[PDB]
Structures are given as C-alpha cells and as structure tokens.
Amino acid sequence: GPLSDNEEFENVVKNGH
Amino acid sequence: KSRSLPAERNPLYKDDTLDHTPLIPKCRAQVIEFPDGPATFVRLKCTNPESKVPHFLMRMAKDSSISATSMFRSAFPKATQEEEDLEMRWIRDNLNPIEDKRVAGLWVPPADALALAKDYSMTPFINALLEASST
C-alpha cells in the first residue's frame, strides 16, 4: 500500500525527480 | 529582496492557521540506503485537491532538515523553473541551507522551514512533519 510510493520518494530524495 | 513567489498556490494551503495535530498520523517514515549507510526520512504526501497530483514533504530524521524545494513545488504547482531558481537563490542568501552530497535539492534547518511555511501558507503541514515520529 504505502510501498507504492517508496520508489518515487527515494528518487526524489536522491535525484530530485 | 530578489524575490517574487508564484501566483497560483496549491488550494491545499488556503488556511495557514489550522491545527497540525490531526495530520501527524498521516506521516510515514522511510529508510534510504546511501553509499555511506542508511538514513531515515519522514515523509508526508500532499495531494493537491484540484489537480489530484501528489507531492512529498520530506524531512531528515537525524537533524530535521527539510527540503525547501519540495515545499516550493507542492505550494506552487504551476511555477516556472526560473521562479523556482529565483526563490532557491533567495533561500541561499537569506536562510541557512544545509550542504549534503547525498540528497538532491535545497534543504534547510527546521526553523528556516517554518519561516518558509509562513510564506507558503504551509505551517500546519511543516509542523505536523516536524512533530511526526521517526519510529
């Protein structure tokens, strides 16, 4: 559920998008 | 100063005076592994009610540094890149961003973020993000 947004959060943190 | 904020703001932030407490349960903690090791973040998902589009407010667990550019993009969905660069430049010259090789964007200490939250009408959301538990 909340795992759906794990990847995009981590990519925003590390690369800004 | 060298500043002019975008004109259209996320309707989510119409009222800066609301109590933040009901928002705290909606934060999530997430661990991200970096070359030098793992670090924990607290994130709050903010869906603009009219474009249905979600952004993350994000906070570092260890020192509560908050991504100012994530705040900006959630507050001003129709901002140009020149508007963003203008304001991030402003944050540099008037606040005290942190420097961190591992994370993209401009991050600032808690008190700076709450100063921005007043400007962006996001005070309930930053308060909830800062008061949320990392565990």
Numbering used by the authors:
A (entry chain B): 85 to 101
B (entry chain A): 6 to 140
Q: Anything the authors wrote about it?
A:
Bqt4 is one of the most abundant INM proteins in fission yeast Schizosaccharomyces pombe, and plays crucial roles in chromosome-NE association by interacting with different protein partners. Here, we report the crystal structures of the N-terminal domain of Bqt4 in complexes with Bqt4-binding motifs from Rap1, Lem2, and Sad1. The Bqt4NTD comprises six α helices and six β strands arranged in a compact α/β fold. Overall, our data suggest that Bqt4NTD is a protein-interaction module that recognizes a consensus motif.
Among these proteins, Sad1 has been shown to interact with Bqt1, and mediates the attachment of telomeres to the NE during meiosis. A 14-residue fragment of Sad1 (residues 88–101), referred to as Sad1BBM, can bind Bqt4NTD with the dissociate constant of 3.7 μM, as shown by ITC assays. For example, S88 of Sad1, at the N-terminus of Sad1BBM, had been reported to be phosphorylated in three phosphoproteomics analyses.
